[PDB]
C-alpha cells in the first residue's frame, strides 16, 4: 500500500503562509521564506515579551524623575525615601499619579523627603 503524499504537504505549507500574511515580498508568498521569516518572529517576540517588561520600567522612571525634578529632588533619592518610609507603591502607579494626580504625588514626595532623614 503506497501512502501517496497527498494533501499533507500542501495543507501544512498553507498553515504557514497564513502565519506569514503581511510579510514583504516573497516572505509572504514562498513557503521556504515564511519559515525563515517566521523562525525569526518567533524568537523576536519571546525576546521582546521578556524585554517589553523593562521597557515601561524605564518609561515610568523617566516620567517619575521628571516629576521630582519639579519638586527639587531627584529619582535616586526619591525612591530611597519611599524605601525607608515603608511605602511600596510600584513605579507603574507612581508615574500614574505623576500625570493624573499631581497633588497626590507631591504628598508622596514629602513623606519620602522627610523619611530620608
Amino acid at each position: 500500500p503506497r501512502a501517496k503524499t497527498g494533501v499533507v504537504r500542501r495543507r501544512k505549507h498553507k498553515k504557514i503562509l497564513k502565519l506569514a500574511k503581511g510579510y514583504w515580498g516573497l516572505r509572504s508568498k514562498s513557503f521556504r521564506k515564511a519559515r525563515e521569516t517566521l523562525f525569526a518572529a518567533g524568537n523576536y517576540a519571546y525576546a521582546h515579551r521578556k524585554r517589553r517588561k523593562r521597557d515601561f520600567r524605564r518609561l515610568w522612571i523617566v516620567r517619575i524623575n521628571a516629576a521630582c525634578r519639579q519638586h527639587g529632588l531627584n529619582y535616586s533619592t526619591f525612591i530611597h525615601g519611599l524605601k525607608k518610609a515603608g511605602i511600596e507603591v510600584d513605579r507603574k502607579n507612581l508615574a500614574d499619579l505623576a500625570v493624573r494626580e499631581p497633588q497626590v504625588f507631591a504628598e508622596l514626595v514629602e513623606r519620602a523627603k522627610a523619611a530620608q532623614g
Binding site: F56, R63, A66, R69, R100
Partner: protein, 140 residues
C-alpha cells in the same frame, strides 16, 4: 492597566542665554529640553519637547586650550576632502554652528531625533527674530 498617553500638547518656548556658560555643559541640558524628557508624561515616539531659543551663542565659554586645539572635522566625499577647521576659526566666523553641532550630537539619531533639532533655534549675540513667540527665559 495601560499607561497614560499624552493626548496632544501646545509647545513650550524657552529663552536661554549662552553667554558665559561652558559649551558642552550647556548643550547637555538644552538637549533634555529639546528631547523634552523633563516633562512628567514624556513619550519617546512623538515630538513633544521644548522649542529652545538660544542667545549670545558666540559669547560661550570653553575650558582648556580647546579654543585653539579642539578641531572640527568634516569630510567632503572627494579625496583629501577631509576638511579640518579649528574651534577658534569656527565661532570666529560661523559662531552659532558650535553650539548646534554639539547639541545635534547629544540628540538621538534618525527621524524624531533629527526632527527635534529643528526646534532648537540658535542666534549668536544680543537677540532673536521672534519675540512674537513669547519665549520664557529659563536661568539654568
Amino acid at each position: 492597566m495601560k499607561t497614560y498617553v499624552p493626548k496632544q500638547v501646545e509647545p513650550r518656548w524657552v529663552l536661554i542665554d549662552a553667554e558665559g556658560k561652558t559649551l558642552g555643559r550647556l548643550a547637555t541640558k538644552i538637549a533634555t529640553l529639546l528631547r523634552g524628557k523633563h516633562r512628567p508624561d514624556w513619550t519617546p515616539n512623538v515630538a513633544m519637547g521644548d522649542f529652545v531659543v538660544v542667545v549670545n551663542a558666540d559669547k560661550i565659554r570653553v575650558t582648556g586650550k580647546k579654543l585653539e586645539q579642539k578641531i572640527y572635522t568634516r569630510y567632503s566625499g572627494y579625496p583629501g576632502g577631509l576638511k579640518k577647521i579649528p574651534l577658534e576659526k569656527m565661532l570666529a566666523t560661523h559662531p552659532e554652528r558650535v553650539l548646534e553641532h554639539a547639541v545635534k550630537g547629544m540628540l538621538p539619531k534618525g527621524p524624531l531625533g533629527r526632527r527635534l533639532f529643528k526646534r532648537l533655534k540658535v542666534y549668536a549675540g544680543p537677540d532673536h527674530p521672534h519675540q512674537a513667540q513669547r519665549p520664557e527665559k529659563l536661568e539654568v
